[PDB]
Amino acid sequence: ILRCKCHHHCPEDSVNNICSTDGYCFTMIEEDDSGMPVVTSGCLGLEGSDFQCRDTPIPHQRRSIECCTERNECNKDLHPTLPPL
Amino acid sequence: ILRCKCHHHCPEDSVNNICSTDGYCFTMIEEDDSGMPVVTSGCLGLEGSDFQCRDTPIPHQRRSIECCTERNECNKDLHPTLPPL
Amino acid sequence: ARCSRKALHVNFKDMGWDDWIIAPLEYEAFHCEGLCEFPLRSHLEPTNHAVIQTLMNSMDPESTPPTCCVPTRLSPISILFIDSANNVVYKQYEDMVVESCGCR
Amino acid sequence: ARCSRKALHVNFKDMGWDDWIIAPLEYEAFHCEGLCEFPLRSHLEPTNHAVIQTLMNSMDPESTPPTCCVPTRLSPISILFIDSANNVVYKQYEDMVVESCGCR
């Protein structure tokens, strides 16, 4: 039972910008159509995490995600970077 | 394990216009936007059947459904009629 | 708006069923609705499959639509009603109320 | 087209994962897709809730969308892959392949 931060997108069965999970904390950076880095963070469950905790290149989108389990809120100290052109 | 007829809409894990179920055979009559009686038939499962085996008035649609379990293909001898204006 | 539980107020009288159903004539069923987007967060309890499909959709929206926001836990309600033999029956119906939503 | 199982061909190389995944690099995942319309037929194995929502949608499409065509049984596949410690691992992943579809 791991606690994680969220700021962009964070669930209403969980106040104070903290979510709990059996999986992983994540931080993601994304280029919104604007093209400003928009970073988000939260909890990923155990099932599916092998596939979510790595990057898959999507056309017309720049995105990178990282995961962690080392400590509560370990995702505060994840700093994913966008894939270069 | 009851067998039923279908002619309009009938599943491809079940050839020969016969479907098997633990619930009910049904026949339905429906007024397609054309306004010709379009009749269909098939199998309904047990769960949900209290709610499906009776009519609920829908606006701009004329529809009636009936169900049966008395014998294999009992739905051949169901003749639902459309709700009057 | 991300995939989540929203209200669905069911009125049986509105359905014309006040002729067999005695009580209750209304109840809160809830529905799921909302986007299922990468990454599929823990509360959405995705399958391996939903994750793969979500990835595939966003890299080729022709191959497959996105995954769907649907109920993943449900609870029952009992209904008091008249049956075809004219018995009054009090029956627990399963899977009547959305308790949680997720991407499948 | 009514709710049913359609093809989803997954190519891991296409996903860039050929750097950790050794085998297989492709597999058939299938997806569900299609209309969920009254009455919800037996093979679609609806819940009580899906039936109610289906009725409600068609009498008031504002209150709730129709129900969704989603997988209702899934099967696993094993994947041979390299982990972060550089071990080669052969692992069964659950819920990888759509075996049946239904309205939820």
Side-chain angles (χ1 to χ4, degrees), chain B residues 6-77:
Chain B
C6 12
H7 52 276
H8 280 97
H9 272 299
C10 193
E12 270 327 13
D13 35 314
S14 89
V15 300
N16 217 130
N17 292 288
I18 296 284
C19 59
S20 307
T21 192
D22 63 347
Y24 289 91
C25 306
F26 82 83
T27 304
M28 176 172 77
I29 191 176
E30 205 156 20
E31 244 200 1
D32 44 323
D33 324 78
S34 274
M36 351 284 284
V38 155
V39 16
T40 57
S41 59
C43 293
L44 302 189
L46 211 295
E47 190 173 340
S49 60
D50 284 5
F51 305 124
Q52 294 195 113
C53 289
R54 59 213 331 144
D55 298 325
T56 313
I58 275 121
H60 318 300
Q61 282 211 250
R62 280 170 94 205
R63 173 212 289 170
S64 176
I65 190 176
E66 286 171 24
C67 292
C68 64
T69 58
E70 50 274 28
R71 86 213 169 275
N72 277 5
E73 278 191 81
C74 56
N75 56 334
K76 282 199 158 179
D77 287 313

Side-chain angles (χ1 to χ4, degrees), chain C residues 15-27:
Chain C
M15 309 221 189
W17 298 348
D18 44 317
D19 56 355
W20 62 290
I21 299 181
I22 308 172
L25 257 31
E26 344 211 331
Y27 88 95

Side-chain angles (χ1 to χ4, degrees), chain C residues 1-8 29-35 98 101:
Chain C
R2 285 220 337 266
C3 170
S4 64
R5 197 178 71 153
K6 303 175 165 73
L8 215 213
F30 300 96
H31 75 269
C32 301
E33 180 180 355
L35 304 183
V98 178
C101 294

Side-chain angles (χ1 to χ4, degrees), chain A:
Chain A
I1 287 144
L2 220 199
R3 283 142 94 277
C4 307
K5 262 277 157 155
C6 12
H7 52 276
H8 280 97
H9 272 299
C10 193
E12 270 327 13
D13 35 314
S14 89
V15 300
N16 217 130
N17 292 288
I18 296 284
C19 59
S20 307
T21 192
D22 63 347
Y24 289 91
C25 306
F26 82 83
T27 304
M28 176 172 77
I29 191 176
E30 205 156 20
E31 244 200 1
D32 44 323
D33 324 78
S34 274
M36 351 284 284
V38 155
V39 16
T40 57
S41 59
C43 293
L44 302 189
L46 211 295
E47 190 173 340
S49 60
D50 284 5
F51 305 124
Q52 294 195 113
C53 289
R54 59 213 331 144
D55 298 325
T56 313
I58 275 121
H60 318 300
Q61 282 211 250
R62 280 170 94 205
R63 173 212 289 170
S64 176
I65 190 176
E66 286 171 24
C67 292
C68 64
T69 58
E70 50 274 28
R71 86 213 169 275
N72 277 5
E73 278 191 81
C74 56
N75 56 334
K76 282 199 158 179
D77 287 313
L78 294 177
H79 310 286
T81 52
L82 291 163
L85 173 267

Side-chain angles (χ1 to χ4, degrees), chain B residues 9 21 43 47-48 52 58, chain D residues 2 40-42 48 51 58-59:
Chain B
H9 272 299
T21 192
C43 293
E47 190 173 340
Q52 294 195 113
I58 275 121
Chain D
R2 285 220 337 266
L40 301 184
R41 280 157 186 254
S42 182
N48 277 321
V51 174
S58 90
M59 82 195 39

